[PDB]
Design a protein around this ligand. Structure first.
Ligand SMILES: CCOc1ccnc(CCNC(=S)Nc2ccc(C#N)cn2)c1F
Lengths: 402, 525
């Protein structure tokens, strides 16, 4: 019943983010949902005295005709004080990322129970927009712990472990990790035996009031060289270029013998037999590439970056690093349309990041803000939102990944 | 009455303490009278010598009227008053409206005065009326309601209004009310008399909270000349545009014209400004007279034509899908119009935005699509079904190819020349038989060819394209070009068909000509 006084970081003020235009459908959906949340005293209309705003969105649930309100507290969270989550502040189980199979649960609703510090409420302000600006826009602010704010899982943490210690004690063969509104449940049991233990938690959670990841089967898609019958000047050329680029990572890559096949302005299609001398160079470079560069360790105090490339035909590639070239992971994704796909990869990549390091990475998306801002909510399903940025991919990069 | 909105000063800061400018004994009197009326009605109330705070007050005469009017300066106060959510900036575009049988707008009287002010703030609104005699009163009052000229008055007022309106609205879903400063625009498909009736229910309902409205005999009804457009309950157009028949054109004249011209485009299709718009090149002064070019004259004359006959946009019929059509009005220029009923325009418009130094029709047309979608979502809360002069085969090809990902809504091809197409494609594989140019300012081919040149006033990047150009130049129908410039590569790999750089446009020219072209990149030294 008492509220833990939360505060924004020093000097910081509340977010005044713009609200991207929403389709009629979406608004209606939000109008229904909020009207309800209001009746149940979760939220409340606000006066003009409140100048703050957070973007709100309506997304459809996977395998459900129901809509879910997604508030983009990205900025609010950003300017929200830290909480001592060092001492018994979870933190992150190295075991999970390998616990065979894992299911993700949305416990957001659990927050609706705890009331939110009144002095902080004003910052949760958000608006349900209106078409063609016919009317002011419905304004609200949360009274309870709001789903999506980084303060929620914290304040609830207490009561949360409380409600979980039993199941934990009961099934210590199960890893249970919480992230914002999500609950990552990992185990090695057999599928049928898994989905069951999950339901046991589904209901053990109801006692107080739908994914299917496979962490163990993830791998670092490395860089690869063409391996062909005959080698034309062009091949060599491209081959050398790629090699040249990769050398900045793996220093043991020599191209000497390969560049010597290029001496001379031959015709691009002229076939060049590989002089044994060179043939071994390839062999070597080829072997140096069989594994990630040595000494790439994750640093919790540094931002986790994510770059995706549109490989083509519904294929994409990404890399997660904190420091240029020093990739922590590298993978690919295969299927729709570009956007749907892109949003899927994004969500998938975030999930992994969470599961592995416990943080959402910062994506560099190869799209146009307007487009993304238009359809992302059309296929998005997660309850969190990574930070993104939009960029133009240099043709060569995409080449070096396949 | 209305519920008070709690106001506060920005943090740290304190209320405003400003000296009252000197006053004319004639004014001193005029005010005392105005500020008595206000005190009597309760809008303000004499305060004590306790309140230090105080903002200056002035006296003015109603423009082209003979009497006295009070004017309080709240600049300082407003610089000390917290920020509010604040009114909207975005107004409803005509084409977004649904046709209404009848519409009438009401001017709200003393709305700000008919609205209370948070007591804990009332003090901050303190001012003083100097007493004539050297040693006399010089009375101090403070506002009780919303002060005209004060920061939070609009927001609060509007906000309050919305609260007041809530009920009525609730039981009159048929009625559609729009809040706009001190005007209430009401529309309904009610039968004339029935309409005029609810208008009376409203007026009273407003009076319930002291809100006074204008009387029917002196109200305001269609045509409604609103923010640039002439609004009729059935249709809408822009307020008639008269093109000056000037003999001598100056730089402002043009800029002004070009601007008014742009305005029209949102409804008058076919308006073009290019020729006018290159009359502004190298201009040295805002008053320079530019003699009109022949095509400029041709254009102006052509635009007069389109403007001569008033056209109309119709309202949004939420029952029918929205349809969107685009055409290429020229290089960089695209035109589009949105209708629900076959050519029953709700809105039209152009698109000349070039996103990047280089581009192709496919890319640009897509961007046009995106621009429209956004717009539509805002006006009709939904995305239209597009009709495009491009084949899926054409689109989907460039699609897959491009590195950036893109998506165009449900759309239908429309064989309406000109059709957007790709003038060329780079060969996916080096060409067997074709000569191979290795460009670095010159080139060298597998066939002995050479041509090292030097130049004047060049850019590092410019030199690179130069080479390639020369390569295309001197080559035959099928070329393999090899280069180290990753720059030039990205540009061409984009297969642009238009650019600002003439050079590039030339190269493009070459490319469209070739039979087959293989562009390859290679490392530095
Ligand atoms: C001058 C137009 O004022 C308005 C602007 C925005 N909204 C309203 C409320 C009702 N609007 C709707 S859906 N209908 C319409 C239709 C035609 C006209 C005219 N002439 C005005 N409003 C207005 F009446």
């Amino acid at each position: 019943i008492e509220t833990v006084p939360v505060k924004l970081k020093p000097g910081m003020d509340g977010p005044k983010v713009k609200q991207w235009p929403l389709t009629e459908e979406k608004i209606k959906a939000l109008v229904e949902i909020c009207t309800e949340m209001e009746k149940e005293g979760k939220i409340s209309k606000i006066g003009p005295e409140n100048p703050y705003n957070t973007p709100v969105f309506a997304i459809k649930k996977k395998d459900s005709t129901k809509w879910r309100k997604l508030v983009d507290f990205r900025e609010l969270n950003k300017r929200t004080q830290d909480f001592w989550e060092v001492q018994l502040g979870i933190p992150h189980p190295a075991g999970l990322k390998k616990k065979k199979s894992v299911t993700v649960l949305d416990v957001g609703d659990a927050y609706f129970s705890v009331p939110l510090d009144e002095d902080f409420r004003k910052y949760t302000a958000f608006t349900i927009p209106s078409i063609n600006n016919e009317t002011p826009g419905i304004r609200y602010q949360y009274n309870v712990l709001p789903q999506g704010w980084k303060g929620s899982p914290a304040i609830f943490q207490s009561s949360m472990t409380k409600i979980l210690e039993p199941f934990r004690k009961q099934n210590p063969d199960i890893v249970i990790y919480q992230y914002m509104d999500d609950l990552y449940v990992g185990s090695d049991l057999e599928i049928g035996q898994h989905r069951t233990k999950i339901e046991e938690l589904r209901q053990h959670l109801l006692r107080w009031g739908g994914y299917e990841l496979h962490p163990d089967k993830w791998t670092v898609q490395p860089i690869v060289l063409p391996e062909k019958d005959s080698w034309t000047v062009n091949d060599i050329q491209k081959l050398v270029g790629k090699l040249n680029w990769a050398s900045q990572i793996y220093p043991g890559i020599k191209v000497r013998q390969l560049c010597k096949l290029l001496r001379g302005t031959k015709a691009l299609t002229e076939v060049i037999p590989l002089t044994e001398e060179a043939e071994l160079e390839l062999a070597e470079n080829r072997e140096i590439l069989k594994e990630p560069v040595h000494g790439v360790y994750y640093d919790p105090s540094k931002d986790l970056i994510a770059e995706i490339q549109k490989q083509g035909q519904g294929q994409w590639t990404y890399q997660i690093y904190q420091e240029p070239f020093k990739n922590l992971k590298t993978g690919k994704y295969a299927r729709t349309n570009d956007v749907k796909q892109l949003t899927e990869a994004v969500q998938k990549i975030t999930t992994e990041s969470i599961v592995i390091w416990g943080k959402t990475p910062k994506f560099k998306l190869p799209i146009q803000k307007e487009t993304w801002e238009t359809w992302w909510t059309e296929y998005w399903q997660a309850t969190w939102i990574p930070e993104w940025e939009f960029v133009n991919t240099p043709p060569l990069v995409k080449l070096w990944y396949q | 009455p209305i519920e008070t909105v709690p106001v506060k000063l920005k943090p740290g800061m304190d209320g405003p303490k400003v000296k009252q400018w000197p006053l004319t004994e004639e004014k001193i009197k005029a005010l005392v009278e105005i500020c008595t009326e206000m005190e009597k009605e309760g809008k303000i109330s004499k305060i004590g010598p306790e309140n230090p705070y105080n903002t200056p007050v002035f006296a003015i005469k109603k423009k082209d009227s003979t009497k006295w009017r009070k004017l309080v300066d709240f600049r300082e106060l407003n610089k000390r008053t917290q920020d509010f959510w604040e009114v909207q900036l975005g107004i409803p575009h005509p084409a977004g409206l649904k046709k209404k049988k009848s519409v009438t707008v009401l001017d709200v009287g003393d709305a700000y005065f008919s609205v209370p002010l948070d007591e804990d703030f009332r003090k901050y609104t303190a001012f003083t009326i100097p007493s004539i005699n050297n040693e006399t009163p010089g009375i101090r009052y403070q506002y009780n309601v919303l002060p005209q000229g004060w920061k939070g008055s609009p927001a609060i007022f509007q906000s309050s209004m919305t609260k007041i309106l809530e009920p009525f609205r609730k039981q009159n879903p048929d009625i559609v009310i729009y809040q706009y400063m001190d005007d209430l625009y009401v529309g309904s498909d009610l039968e004339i008399g029935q309409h005029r009736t609810k208008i009376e229910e409203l007026r009273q309902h407003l009076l319930r909270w002291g809100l006074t409205t204008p009387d029917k005999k002196h109200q305001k009804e269609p045509p409604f000349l609103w923010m640039g457009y002439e609004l009729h309950p059935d249709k809408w157009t822009v307020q008639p545009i008269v093109l000056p028949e000037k003999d001598s054109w100056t730089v402002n004249d043009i800029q002004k014209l070009v601007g008014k011209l742009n305005w029209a485009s949102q409804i008058y299709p076919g308006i073009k400004v290019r020729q006018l718009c290159k009359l502004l090149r190298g201009t040295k002064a805002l008053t320079e007279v530019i003699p009109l070019t022949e095509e400029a004259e041709l254009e102006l004359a052509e635009n007069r034509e389109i403007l001569k006959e008033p056209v109309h946009g119709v309202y949004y019929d939420p029952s029918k899908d929205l349809i969107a059509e685009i055409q290429k009005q020229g290089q960089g220029q695209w035109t589009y119009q949105i209708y629900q009923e076959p050519f029953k325009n709700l809105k039209t418009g152009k698109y000349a935005r070039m996103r990047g130094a280089h581009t192709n029709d496919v890319k640009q047309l897509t961007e046009a699509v995106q621009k429209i979608t956004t717009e539509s979502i805002v006006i009709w809360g939904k995305t239209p079904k597009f009709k495009l002069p491009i084949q899926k085969e054409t689109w989907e090809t460039w699609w897959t190819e491009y590195w950036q990902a893109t998506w165009i809504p449900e759309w239908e091809f429309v064989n309406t020349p000109p059709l957007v197409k790709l003038w060329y494609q780079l060969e996916k594989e080096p060409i067997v038989g074709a000569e191979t140019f290795y460009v670095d300012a010159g080139y060298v081919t597998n066939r002995g060819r050479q041509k090292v040149v030097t130049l004047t006033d060049t850019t590092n990047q410019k030199t690179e394209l130069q080479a390639i150009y020369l390569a295309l130049q001197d080559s035959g129908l099928e070329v393999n070009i090899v280069t180290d410039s990753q720059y030039a590569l990205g540009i061409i790999q984009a297969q642009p068909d238009q650019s600002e750089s003439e050079l590039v446009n030339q190269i493009i020219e070459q490319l469209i000509k070739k039979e087959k072209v293989y562009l390859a990149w290679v490392p530095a030294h």
